[PDB]
Amino acid sequence: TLSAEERAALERSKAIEKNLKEDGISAAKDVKLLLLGADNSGKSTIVKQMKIITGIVETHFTFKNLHFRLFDVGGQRSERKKWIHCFEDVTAIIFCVDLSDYNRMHESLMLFDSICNNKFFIDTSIILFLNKKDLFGEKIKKSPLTICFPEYTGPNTYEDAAAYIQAQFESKNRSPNKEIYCHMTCATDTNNAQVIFDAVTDIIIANNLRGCGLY
Amino acid sequence: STVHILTRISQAGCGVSMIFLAFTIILYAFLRLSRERFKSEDAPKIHVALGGSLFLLNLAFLVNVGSGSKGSDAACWARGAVFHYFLLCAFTWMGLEAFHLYLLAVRVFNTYFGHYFLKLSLVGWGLPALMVIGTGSANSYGLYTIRDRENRTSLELCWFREGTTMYALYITVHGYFLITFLFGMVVLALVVWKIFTLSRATAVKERGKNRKKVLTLLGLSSLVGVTWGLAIFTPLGLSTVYIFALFNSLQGVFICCWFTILYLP
Amino acid sequence: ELDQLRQEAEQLKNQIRDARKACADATLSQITNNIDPVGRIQMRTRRTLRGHLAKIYAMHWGTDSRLLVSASQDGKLIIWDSYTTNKVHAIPLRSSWVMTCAYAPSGNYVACGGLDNICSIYNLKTREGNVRVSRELAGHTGYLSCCRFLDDNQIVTSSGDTTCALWDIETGQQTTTFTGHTGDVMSLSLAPDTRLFVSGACDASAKLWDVREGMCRQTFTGHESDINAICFFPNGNAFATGSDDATCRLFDLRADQELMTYSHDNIICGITSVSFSKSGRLLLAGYDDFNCNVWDALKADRAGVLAGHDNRVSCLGVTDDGMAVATGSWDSFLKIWN
Amino acid sequence: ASIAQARKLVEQLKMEANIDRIKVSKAAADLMAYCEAHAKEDPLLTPVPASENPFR
Ligand SMILES: CC(C)CCC[C@@H](C)[C@H]1CC[C@H]2[C@@H]3CC=C4C[C@@H](OC(=O)CCC(=O)O)CC[C@]4(C)[C@H]3CC[C@]12C
Ligand SMILES: CC(C)CCC[C@@H](C)[C@H]1CC[C@H]2[C@@H]3CC=C4C[C@@H](O)CC[C@]4(C)[C@H]3CC[C@]12C
Numbered sequence: 101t102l103s104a105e106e107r108a109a110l111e112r113s114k115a116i117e118k119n120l121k122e123d124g125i126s127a128a129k130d131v132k133l134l135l136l137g138a139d140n141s142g143k144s145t146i147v148k149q150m151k152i153i154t155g156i157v158e159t160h161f162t163f164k165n166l167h168f169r170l171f172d173v174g175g176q177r178s179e180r181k182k183w184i185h186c187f188e189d190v191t192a193i194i195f196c197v198d199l200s201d202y203n204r205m206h207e208s209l210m211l212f213d214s215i216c217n218n219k220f221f222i223d224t225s226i227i228l229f230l231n232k233k234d235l236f237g238e239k240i241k242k243s244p245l246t247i248c249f250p251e252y253t254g255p256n257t258y259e260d261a262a263a264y265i266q267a268q269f270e271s272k273n274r275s276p277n278k279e280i281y282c283h284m285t286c287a288t289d290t291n292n293a294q295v296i297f298d299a300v301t302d303i304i305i306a307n308n309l310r311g312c313g314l315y
Numbered sequence: 316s317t318v319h320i321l322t323r324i325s326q327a328g329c330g331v332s333m334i335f336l337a338f339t340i341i342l343y344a345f346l347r348l349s350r351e352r353f354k355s356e357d358a359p360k361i362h363v364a365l366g367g368s369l370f371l372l373n374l375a376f377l378v379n380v381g382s383g384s385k386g387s388d389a390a391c392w393a394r395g396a397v398f399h400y401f402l403l404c405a406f407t408w409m410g411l412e413a414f415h416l417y418l419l420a421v422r423v424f425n426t427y428f429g430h431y432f433l434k435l436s437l438v439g440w441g442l443p444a445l446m447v448i449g450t451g452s453a454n455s456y457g458l459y460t461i462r463d464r465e466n467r468t469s470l471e472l473c474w475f476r477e478g479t480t481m482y483a484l485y486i487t488v489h490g491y492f493l494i495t496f497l498f499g500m501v502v503l504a505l506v507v508w509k510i511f512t513l514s515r516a517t518a519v520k521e522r523g524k525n526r527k528k529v530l531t532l533l534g535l536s537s538l539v540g541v542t543w544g545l546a547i548f549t550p551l552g553l554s555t556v557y558i559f560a561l562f563n564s565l566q567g568v569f570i571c572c573w574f575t576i577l578y579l580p
Numbered sequence: 581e582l583d584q585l586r587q588e589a590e591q592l593k594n595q596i597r598d599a600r601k602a603c604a605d606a607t608l609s610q611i612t613n614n615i616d617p618v619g620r621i622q623m624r625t626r627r628t629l630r631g632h633l634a635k636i637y638a639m640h641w642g643t644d645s646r647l648l649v650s651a652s653q654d655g656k657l658i659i660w661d662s663y664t665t666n667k668v669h670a671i672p673l674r675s676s677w678v679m680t681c682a683y684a685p686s687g688n689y690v691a692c693g694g695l696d697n698i699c700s701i702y703n704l705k706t707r708e709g710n711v712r713v714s715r716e717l718a719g720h721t722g723y724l725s726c727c728r729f730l731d732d733n734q735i736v737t738s739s740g741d742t743t744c745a746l747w748d749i750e751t752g753q754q755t756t757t758f759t760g761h762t763g764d765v766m767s768l769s770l771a772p773d774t775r776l777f778v779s780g781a782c783d784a785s786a787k788l789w790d791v792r793e794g795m796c797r798q799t800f801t802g803h804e805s806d807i808n809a810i811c812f813f814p815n816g817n818a819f820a821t822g823s824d825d826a827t828c829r830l831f832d833l834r835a836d837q838e839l840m841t842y843s844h845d846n847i848i849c850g851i852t853s854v855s856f857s858k859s860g861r862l863l864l865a866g867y868d869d870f871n872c873n874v875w876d877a878l879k880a881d882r883a884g885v886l887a888g889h890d891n892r893v894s895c896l897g898v899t900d901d902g903m904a905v906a907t908g909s910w911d912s913f914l915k916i917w918n
Numbered sequence: 919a920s921i922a923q924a925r926k927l928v929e930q931l932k933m934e935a936n937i938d939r940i941k942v943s944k945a946a947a948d949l950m951a952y953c954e955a956h957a958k959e960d961p962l963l964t965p966v967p968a969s970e971n972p973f974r
């Protein structure tokens with residue numbers, strides 16, 4: 101710390117430390133959202149204005165002076181258990197589900213089962229969407245909800261079927277201290293950035309109130 | 316000799332609180348040394364600073380009660396000034412912890428300010444400094460006798476002196492407690508309102524988790540407030556020293572167990 | 581026609597297994613019992629290199645035994661100076677999701693890659709004061725799990741598409757492709773003479789590869805679970821591996837079979853990294869219980885433990901001259917032990 | 919179909935089959951020899967005093 105070369109070295113160390121602190125405060129104000137879900141469930145247009153930007157795909161829409169970063173981890177086609185711990189630092193797991201389909205329903209349910217009970221994602225909250233509600237309400241009349249869920253025998257109605265499906269999804273929690281902020285997006289005439297905003301705010305408030313002992 | 320009883324009981328309760336707050340300070344030093352990443356958290360700093368403020372307040376109260384009615388006048392002039400300073404420090408630290416709760420549960424996003432704990436500590440240790448400087452500029456400290464309806468000296472202390480007008484005492488102790496309690500209750504009301512508004516937008520009305528956490532936080536904070544209100548506004552006579560010592564012991568133990576459960580996995 | 585080929589392959593693997601059983605006359609412990617063990621080894625945290633914001637996924641020592649690289653999910657590739665904890669560089673990564681870093685044996689280049697399926701090569705000895713992305717290598721269909729420079733002009737990288745590939749950093753295209761794995765390749769390790777290299781995959785098999793020939797030579801199967809870590813022996817005639825079964829195993833390139841196993845009942849966490857000492861007497865292995873056990877590579881006795889991290893210890897590397905051991909971790913604090 | 923990879927697999931397996939192997943005793947002896955011929959140059963195996971280690 102006396103010679104010229106060591107002095108210049110310490111100067112470079114300090115300039116780099118300052119840049120690191122600047123980027124560390126500039127990058128912590130974004131929200132990271134892991135975007136799971138079976139394919140063709142409208143996960144590519146969960147928000148109308150995303151401004152997107154094979155591996156992990158990013159989309160970075162902004163809303164109410166806050167930067168949301170959405171990572172679609174479909175397309176990796178590798179061992180999910182081997183790189184899923186990259187995303188242990190996300191705030192919430194968005195999870196789109198296509199209601200108008202019947203073959204992808206059990207795949208979606210099994211994927212949700214595997215995710216909601218992982219060891220890295222055991223306290224990360226889920227924001228479960230349910231896309232294409234109107235097409236479901238149109239299809240439910242012609243095809244009852246028994247060719248998809250045989251154990252179901254309640255009344256054949258839009259409301260009862262949708263509530264039963266949502267209950268079937270939410271019944272895989274198996275781990276309190278994590279809530280499933282469900283929602284039913286019509287996928288045609290909906291503006292659901294506010295749903296993400298409010299669910300994220302509640303997640304972060306719960307995260308902080310649990311940092312002050314509250315349990 | 317009621318002086319004996321009052322002195323001994325106040326001393327014992329104060330000492331138990333001192334023991335537990337010292338345990339808290341020691342455990343904070345151990346946690347800060349033995350673990351990285353604990354130096355950047357600011358909530359434990361606010362907690363340990365409030366604990367230390369209560370510890371020093373207890374120490375000042377012990378010094379006053381033990382050596383009352385003895386020494387020169389301008390000596391425990393400064394003694395009472397110090398005791399007032401530490402009382403106002405405890406109050407300002409409860410207020411600053413309410414403000415921290417405001418930053419965590421009302422304004423949730425973009426709450427990063429450089430030198431956060433520096434500014435908090437500056438406020439919490441230098442606002443009572445101005446208060447005491449002012450209060451002393453008028454020579455308001457001195458002896459303070461407690462009669463207990465008999466006009467007999469039940470306990471000699473040298474809190475604010477009796478000069479037929481107590482504007483200083485009420486404006487700078489009771490008024491400060493009320494201002495801080497009001498700030499705390501306003502912040503708690505804003506927290507409750509925000510939680511019960513979000514409980515409608517997320518469509519999870521009853522199941523919501525925060526609807527219970529915030530009610531528990533309110534039920535504890537209002538208790539912590541009303542117990543200090545009862546401590547201040549009621550006069551320290553006989554048959555009410557036991558309750559005060561017990562309140563102090565519990566105010567110590569709760570801080571100790573809260574800090575040792577929150578920061579030991 | 582298919583079934584008879586299956587029977588022929590089964591008979592061939594039986595012949596291989598019986599040959600390996602016939603070559604095994606005495607166990608390694610039976611030979612090394614008469615050696616006096618190492619005393620208790622207590623290493624102390626000399627330095628602590630802080631400055632990373634997110635978890636640290638890979639580090640790598642320089643050949644000059646002084647500088648080391650670190651990569652983290654915060655998107656920063658820092659090139660430290662371990663002597664005076666002096667950040668020589670900090671390169672901003674284009675992709676925040678990186679799982680490996682490499683440091684050329686000349687000290688002039690640094691490589692990085694991860695979930696973006698690309699191995700970028702960052703120059704260091706530029707004329708001006710800058711570190712520009714020299715050449716991006718994109719020929720894989722899966723995340724890159726490891727990379728290792730041969731020269732400052734050739735790099736061999738593994739990936740999650742089950743195939744390793746030797747590149748030509750000057751051109752930008754694969755010069756060879758090493759295929760034959762079933763699961764995806766998780767780690768590789770270069771030989772001291774940089775002519776061979778081993779590789780572990782999630783099919784619980786470690787295969788020896790020939791660089792110039794592009795063909796596989798041998799294969800080893802002792803583990804049950806995935807293989808995360810692999811490291812050659814200092815003389816290039818053995819290697820140890822790490823697995824999620826909480827055991828490390830020493831394999832041999834001549835006897836063609838496992839020589840010894842490193843297990844303990846109090847250990848049920850998966851090995852995250854392995855590395856040898858300068859003479860090969862110590863076998864370091866970073867675990868998931870946040871500790872870093874230092875094994876006795878000839879006695880299988882747990883010599884010492886380096887418990888200094890609060891989260892999982894992800895990377896681990898012994899200095900090229902055997903001076904220190906730098907164990908990165910997920911709590912973002914590298915530590916130099918000695 | 920899978921017959922192509924079947925031929926490739928049986929070819930690689932037969933190629934790996936006919937290789938030269940030695941006894942485990944010899945291999946263990948060589949590991950012993952290497953671990954005992956470089957024991958004096960192991961700064962982690964045998965500690966060095968604080969006057970030599972650059973990370974003192
Ligand atoms: C953020 C910073 C700038 C706040 C600074 C506050 C102080 C500079 C002022 C604000 C309220 C004032 C106090 C209001 C009234 C009193 C009571 C007064 O008591 C008396 O002895 C005079 C009246 C009486 O004796 O009856 C002495 C001054 C004091 C403490 C004042 C002191 C000076 C204070 C603390
Ligand atoms: C009565 C007024 C005028 C003077 C008061 C002097 C003493 C009692 C006051 C004034 C400054 C105060 C200190 C300010 C800073 C610190 C450092 C902190 O980490 C512990 C509290 C501590 C140590 C305070 C203790 C009480 C203190 C020393």
Ligand SMILES: CC(C)CCC[C@@H](C)[C@H]1CC[C@H]2[C@@H]3CC=C4C[C@@H](O)CC[C@]4(C)[C@H]3CC[C@]12C
Pocket residue numbers: 432433436437440441444
């Ligand atoms: C005696 C005069 C100055 C009045 C008293 C002023 C003192 C008590 C005030 C003014 C500046 C304040 C300090 C400002 C900065 C820090 C550094 C922080 O890490 C701990 C609190 C601490 C140490 C504060 C303690 C209280 C403080 C020292």
Ligand SMILES: C[C@H]1C[C@H]2[C@@H]3CCC4=CC(=O)C=C[C@]4(C)[C@@]3(Cl)[C@@H](O)C[C@]2(C)[C@@]1(O)C(=O)CO
Pocket residue numbers: 325328329376546547548549550551559560563
């Ligand atoms: C918790 C603190 C707060 C102290 C009071 C501050 C206000 C005061 C002003 C007065 O009018 C008369 C006396 C009191 C009410 C005080 Cl000084 C004493 O009675 C002792 C108390 C409770 C305390 O020190 C104890 O711990 C109990 O022993």
Ligand SMILES: CCCCCCCCCCCCCCCC(=O)O
Pocket residue numbers: 340360363364366367368370371
């Ligand atoms: C009578 C001897 C001195 C007794 C001091 C007891 C402790 C009082 C202050 C407690 C800690 C102050 C705030 C801590 C802030 C920090 O940790 O940086």
Ligand SMILES: CCCCCCCCCCCCCCCC(=O)O
Pocket residue numbers: 407410411414428431434435438494495498
């Ligand atoms: C009246 C007692 C409680 C007083 C506490 C309320 C005021 C606290 C002020 C602390 C400042 C914290 C950092 C401010 C950052 C900023 O807004 O620029």
Ligand SMILES: *C(=O)CCCCCCCCCCCCCCC
Pocket residue numbers: 311312358406409410412413415416419492495496499500503532536537539540543
């Ligand atoms: C989170 O950071 C910790 C919050 C714990 C509760 C905070 C209490 C807020 C209001 C305290 C005021 C109570 C009455 C004050 C009497 C002077």
